[PDB]
Design a protein around this nucleic acid. Structure first.
Length: 74
RNA sequence: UACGGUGAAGGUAACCUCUAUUGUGCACACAUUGCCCGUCACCUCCGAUAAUAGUAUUGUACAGGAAGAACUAUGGCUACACU
């Protein structure tokens, strides 16, 4: 109800961590069967899209405040 | 052609015939010159058969054996729900 609002960010933090390492272990698996069956052509579909699902770069544990300091650098 | 005068010889075993009578046989009636035979001869026509040139299909010896793949997998990836 209102706990689904907190748990959507909570479970979705879990789900994006889940999709990052799951997409990464399949992305490191299709490259092993890339050269054997010509698998680069459909492999780059995964190697683009499964990284580029809803957010590719993560929400930083710091908050990325050092990256902000790199970004607000004069 | 016709009419008389004299005027004899001579006769029965299929002994052929020309039949009949017949009642035993034909595939003959153009009624025995028939019906109709075959080796072959020139040719024509479907066979039957076959060394083989082989192509069409399957069993079996193994290589295989693709796409698939009974089985085997916990390398995974995730929520259901409960912490």
């Amino acid at each position: 109800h209102l706990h689904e609002l907190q748990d959507l960010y909570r479970k979705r933090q879990k789900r994006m961590a889940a999709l990052r390492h799951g997409a990464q272990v399949e992305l490191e698996a299709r490259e092993a069967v890339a050269w054997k069956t010509g698998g680069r052509g459909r492999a780059v579909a995964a190697a683009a899209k499964a990284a580029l699902d809803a957010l590719p770069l993560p929400p930083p544990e710091d908050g990325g405040k050092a990256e902000l300091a790199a970004a607000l650098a004069a």
